[PDB]
Design a protein around this nucleic acid. Structure first.
Lengths: 142, 142
DNA sequence: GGAGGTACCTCA
DNA sequence: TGAGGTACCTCC
């Protein structure tokens, strides 16, 4: 039921598995499925292309980006398998530890993207999806 | 017929005779009567009190400020008797030369403040008043 | 100028 | 967060 709002384009890169971690100033004990919502903040076409170029260098020339990075909607989910301090992140994930310098690093696995994305208004930190949109999101995930 | 738009509170201080010069980056050959209009930019009550404190120190304890500094209106007029370079300003007005460091300094005399001030939309530099507001302004000056 | 789009900032 | 007030910026 629990959701994290993330700015685009990083939001969609997370549910595509291209971005593998998300950094925050705070810790969460939450483990398991974590829904990902894009914030309302639209990214300029410039930062989308620059971030895409960067992730091409990190992941390979032919990585498949989403066609769009829609704002203000529920995108999909990840499994939040750990929430690591920066020190723990460097010890356990040396190959990607450069990808976040935040005090706490959310380690995400098993991303899933919704083919139909639903408009939504987010909140800070981990917040709870409303039942109706949560039910429709799980149905979409077939 | 010619007018200069000036930000408040400086605009009203000019037509009161409290501010004696106005600095600009450009020169004008205009001499004689120059109407003074306040721009639309409203001044914060903080810059009004700080500027009043400063001019109290420059002119004396009991100098009489206007009760209000209205924006976007025709305030009055001065006689523009010279337009001096900064070098000429220092040579000719050593007692007040510190009051403007602009490339050109408009030397104003015989200020008159209108009892009834008329709303107006200004322009850059010296611009020409419309004849209806000019006629009404001259009449107000009795 | 004056007008208004946009980025920035704050939020009993 | 999302919302919107405000300051800042540009202007065939």
């Amino acid at each position: 039921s629990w959701c994290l709002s993330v700015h685009q384009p990083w939001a969609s890169l997370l549910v595509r598995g291209i971005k593998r971690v998300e950094g925050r100033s705070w810790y969460t004990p939450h483990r398991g499925r974590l829904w990902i919502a894009a914030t309302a903040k639209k990214p300029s076409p410039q930062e989308v292309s620059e971030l895409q170029a960067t992730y091409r260098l990190l992941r390979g020339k032919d990585v498949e980006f989403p066609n769009d990075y829609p704002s203000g909607c529920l995108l999909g989910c990840v499994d939040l398998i750990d929430c690591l301090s920066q020190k723990q992140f460097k010890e356990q994930f040396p190959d990607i530890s450069q990808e976040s310098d935040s005090p706490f690093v959310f380690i995400c696995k098993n991303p899933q993207e919704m083919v139909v994305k639903f408009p939504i208004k987010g909140n800070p930190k981990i917040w709870k999806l409303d039942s109706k949109i949560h039910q429709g999101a799980k149905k979409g995930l077939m």
